[PDB]
Design goal:
The structure is cut from a larger assembly and holds 10 protein chains of 10 kinds.
Chain A (H helix, E strand, L loop, with lengths): L3 E3 L4
Chain B lengths: L4 E3 L7 E4 L10 E4 L13 H7 L13
Antiparallel strand pairs in B: 1-2, 2-3
Chain F lengths: L2 E3 L14 E4 L3 E6 L9 H5 L8 H6 L5 H16 L5 H30 L3 H20 L23 H20 L5 H7 L7 H6 L5 H4 L7 H4 L20 H24 L25 H11 L9 E3 L2 E2 L4 E8 L5 E7 L1 H7 L1 H4 L3 E2 L1 H10 L3 H4 L2
Antiparallel strand pairs in F: 1-2, 2-3, 3-8, 4-6, 5-6, 6-7
Helix pairs in contact in F: 3-4, 4-5, 4-11, 4-15, 5-6, 6-11
Classes of the chains: A mainly beta, B alpha+beta, C mainly alpha, D mainly alpha, E alpha+beta, F alpha+beta, G mainly alpha, H mainly beta, I alpha+beta, J mainly beta.
The site of ligand 8Q1 has 18 residues of chain C, from helix 1, helix 3 and helix 4.
Family (chain D): Belongs to the complex I NDUFA13 subunit family.
Protein name (chain D): NADH dehydrogenase [ubiquinone] 1 alpha subcomplex subunit 13-A
Organism (chain D): Arabidopsis thaliana (Mouse-ear cress)
Amino acid sequence: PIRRYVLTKD
Amino acid sequence: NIGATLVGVDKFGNKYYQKLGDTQYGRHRWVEYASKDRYNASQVPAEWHGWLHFITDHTGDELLS
Amino acid sequence: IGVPPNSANLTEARRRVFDFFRAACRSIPTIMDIYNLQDVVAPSQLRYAISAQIRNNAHITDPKVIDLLIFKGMEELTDIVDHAKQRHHIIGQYVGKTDFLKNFYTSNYF
Amino acid sequence: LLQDGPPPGGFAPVRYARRISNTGPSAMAMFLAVSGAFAWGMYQVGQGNKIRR
Amino acid sequence: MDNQFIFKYSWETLPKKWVKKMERSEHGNRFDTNTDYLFQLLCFLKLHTYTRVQVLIDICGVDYPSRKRRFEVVYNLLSTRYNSRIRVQTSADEVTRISSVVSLFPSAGWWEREVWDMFGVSFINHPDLRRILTDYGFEGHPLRKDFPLSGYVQVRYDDPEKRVVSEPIEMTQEFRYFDFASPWE
Amino acid sequence: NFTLNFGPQHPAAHGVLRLVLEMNGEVVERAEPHIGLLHRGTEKLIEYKTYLQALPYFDRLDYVSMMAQEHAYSLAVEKLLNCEVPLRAQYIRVLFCEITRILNHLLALTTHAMDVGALTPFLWAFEEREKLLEFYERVSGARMHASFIRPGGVAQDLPLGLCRDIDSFTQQFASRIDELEEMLTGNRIWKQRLVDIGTVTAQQAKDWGFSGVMLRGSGVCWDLRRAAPYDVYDQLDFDVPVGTRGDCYDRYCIRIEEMRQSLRIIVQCLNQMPSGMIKADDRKLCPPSRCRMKLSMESLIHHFELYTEGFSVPASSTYTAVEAPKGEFGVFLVSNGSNRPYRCKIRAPGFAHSQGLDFMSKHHMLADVVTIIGTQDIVFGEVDR
Amino acid sequence: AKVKQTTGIVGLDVVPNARAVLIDLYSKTLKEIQAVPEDEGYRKAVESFTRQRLNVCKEEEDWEMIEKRLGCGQVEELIEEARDELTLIGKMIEWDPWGVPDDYECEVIENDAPIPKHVPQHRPGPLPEQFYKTLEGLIA
Amino acid sequence: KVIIYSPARTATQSGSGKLGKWKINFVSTLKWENPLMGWTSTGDPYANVGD
Amino acid sequence: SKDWNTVFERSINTLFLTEMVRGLSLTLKYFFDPKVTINYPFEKGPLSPRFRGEHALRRYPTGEERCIACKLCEAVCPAQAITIEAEEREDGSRRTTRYDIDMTKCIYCGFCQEACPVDAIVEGPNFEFATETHEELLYDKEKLLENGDRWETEIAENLRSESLYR
Amino acid sequence: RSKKSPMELISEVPPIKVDGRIVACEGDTNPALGHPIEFICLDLNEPAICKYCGLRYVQDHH
Ligand SMILES: CCCCCCCCCCCCCCCCCCCC(=O)O[C@H](COC(=O)CCCCCCCCCCCCCC)COP(=O)(O)OCCN
Ligand SMILES: CCCCCCCCCCCC(=O)SCCNC(=O)CCNC(=O)[C@H](O)C(C)(C)COP(=O)(O)O
Ligand code: SF4
Ligand code: SF4
Ligand SMILES: [Zn+2]
């Protein structure tokens, strides 16, 4: 159960 | 030296005594070595070793059977 | 005092190396005085030994690596100066046909 | 099937609250037991000195 | 004050570019920064009112000899009045100076030296950074995965000179490494 | 200010303690303890042995609270494994942890008193500690180093004739505590040799990481077994003693009250002892019964693959924390996913207590330093790992 | 009704009439936070709870109600809490950590591994209301 | 002088769970027998580091 | 604050050492009580059937040795004390030709005892085996088998007694 | 006695007689104190040796 989401701006 | 009764004998000659208390430990059972020359510090056999250390309630004479 | 930040460039590390060598030379009478060694060695060739050990590692270009060697040298110097290192170790570290035939005669693995 | 455990009904209660007793000699009476003894003893020493003289 | 509330708050309140990555799990909340904004992050986490992290439990260290940033020091923290735990960690390197946090938590002065001793990650603006655990004449850093378990030098007493002298290691019975690893896992 | 070299070679100062310090002639300025004389190297040796072989490392560390030390390792492994332990095992683990707390407090109190000079309660308390080392002899194989607690449950079930003996001991242990306390608390010399010594403020304790009795001797109600209760402690009823002044005398009173509370918890655990199995059953990390592996195939396979390979902890990392008698003891496990731990750092409570000695002996007498050493209860097995 | 007498914590001597000093610190922090930008969460939260604390302490007149209807510890702990907040404000003004970098990434993981009910897990009671009402304003 | 290689799958067992991992093989081939109990002695510190 | 009636009692108590004679009288109550020490050479302390002492290799009642060279004990020993060498006898069955234990490395943890599938090795209740030479502590196969033979009548009874557990 | 090695001492023990085709050997009389149970199919003209115990079994008649 792995939720790995990488952030980003604009 | 002296105690309540005497519990069996040994092929090495040392006699094993037994005293019974009420609520506190101390002076329960000991050995009077047959010899006196430093008694080798270890002369109890395998049958009487368990009885001396309260490991087993068997006398050691009964442990043979 | 406190540990300085790592040098930005090699010319800033070079003065650090000179300062470390300077401090090592300044403290060199103390080792000879507190470890009771006068006839075995003179203080002059200890300079040569320190210079050799500091010039052997002269090909390093990275400022961080040079700074780390200076750090480790300072720790070793403080260990030696203080009553941490023990006698007959400073003197241990400091102060034909061919090689192949000798190495062959002594062992297989050289 | 013979797990060791508490007896049916539980063990007896135990006290753990640092019971305080009082076996001290006294509170004030020792002062008299010293002072009156001192006075009477000094009188006896005076009588002994007179006898020795 | 629990895991989720702290996660929301430190996601909103914390300035960006500080936490490189973060995790939320039952094992522990992590805040992986980038080995430069460490003093700032700890200072914010120590002085802020809604995160009054006061005590630094320990300063760990993990040697990964497979990544470019070989070492990874771990800062365990604890907030007494909020009753919560924060685990901040970075990525270090064998030749690099990571900032020290003795100014904030004075207790770190000895874990700092121990991390220097075991692995070799030096620190800046630290009063001592002297070896604390190994021998005075010890060489190398033992907790690195490179260091052999038996070590490099042995110690014995020789009679020709009445003193204890170190010598190259030479063991009577070698350390038997049993390879129990199996497939299907 | 001249410098003299401490470092006595005997357990009359706990042994293995250099402690070079600065002297103005009668008042010490800065004391620098030189730890490392007992750096056996457990932390490096952990990574080379499986999760079962590494358990006896934890008995050696802080070798007076044996079962309170391996308990942290067991809890960490259980957390990394999602293993559920039966209730009876939890209760007996709590009981034996309380016994460790009693042993540690007795040993610390009497060693500190003998450092001060009072040598008669020392032998009285070891006479009483005989009775608990005998209990340890009964359940496990060895008197002191007992690998009783395992990640699943406990190693073996309790013997039949144990609870009666434990309750018989607890009947008179309170009177024994009163006898030991009457000789020191009410005494005059003890007060003048402890009061206003080594005072630590709450801010100082928090800054220097003094979790344990030192933290609670400054007015901070931080009990890990109440703030973060791990085993069955919510059911149990006990109080947390908290001091008012950070001097050595209030730490002594706190330790006495902690022994009282430990006796209370032992009584509660003896009363509320359920039946059932001792080892876990959800995951496969427990050996099969020796009367079962000799007639079953899968059980024998499990026995073989557990006593050679061991259980493989899934790859993760965590920091557990239990309330050791010294203070907060925590194990930072990093699991590679294999049967051997990747990295296992051990957070010794005595490490921070020993580093915080420099500011505690600020402007004190030199003989005023041995009492500060005694009041913080430092053993050097945990300090140097 | 009377003086605090003992505070129960060593090294934390009682500060008589702590409400005045507490109000002074809150006012200084409120008038000093104007340096940092409004849009950021840090200011948006510090202004929120500092203003809440100022209102709740100005409504009351004695310590035994100030700490009672806050429930955030004794009236004296709030003093060093506010002092530390002011120190943090000053330090972060000096640092100036603002400005979201253009090339910014943050791998946020949501690992969910269940742990047993018998491992040491911090299980405390609920927080006071303001701790929860602050995040509503922070998000919106 | 070291050798960098990936250990091959063992023939006796059909699982491929130990593959994909690379190791450094220090050639620590110097081992002898203690002439009292038959134990294997070494003088090379890298006897099993790479393993 | 004082009332001229409590300062008198406190000054007197601090002047007549009452709190010291309290402890002085307390220390004397065990002087006439029975003692607790034991005459070790004659009477020894109480042990338990699970005691871990000097190792012993037991054998079958028929006479065949019980060890089958399974090497579980060697692979589970945390201290790496046990060294085993096996070989197929001309009889056909597998047995040990060199089974020795380093009693200097051994820690008496009982892992080897509980890892045997056949109960070949056990820790006897013998806690008195201090020697004079270091090389004697390296227990080889013959010495360990002799230990097993010597304590068999009690080792077997100990195993049978606490067989309800493990 | 100790002059006889166990290999030469087990050979003199007479083989057991079993009426059936397979016999289960458990070591000692108590199952928990012996080796794991081993079922041996004794069909040849030679005794079947228990691999754990070394005991031999001979089939007399069905
Ligand atoms: C059967 C034959 C037996 C022969 C032996 C007698 C029994 C001896 C038993 C000895 C047992 C105790 C031994 C302990 C050794 C150390 C004790 C020293 C304690 C001490 O010095 O404390 C001082 C007070 O005691 C003191 O001052 C001690 C001196 C007290 C003298 C009493 C003076 C009373 C005068 C009353 C006169 C009455 C008549 C007047 C007309 C100072 O106290 P502190 O510094 O600790 O506390 C703050 C005060 N500032
Ligand atoms: C008794 C005393 C105890 C301590 C003794 C010392 C123990 C540690 C000794 C340190 C060991 C090291 O390698 S630490 C020092 C190693 N660092 C360097 O050698 C710098 C690299 N070399 C250069 O920069 C230049 O070539 C240079 C040669 C400097 C000049 O040439 P220039 O001018 O063109 O620059
Ligand atoms: S575990 Fe027992 S049977 Fe197996 S090799 Fe060791 S001693 Fe022999
Ligand atoms: S008792 Fe422990 S250390 Fe000793 S031989 Fe057995 S398994 Fe190895
Ligand atoms: Zn058989």
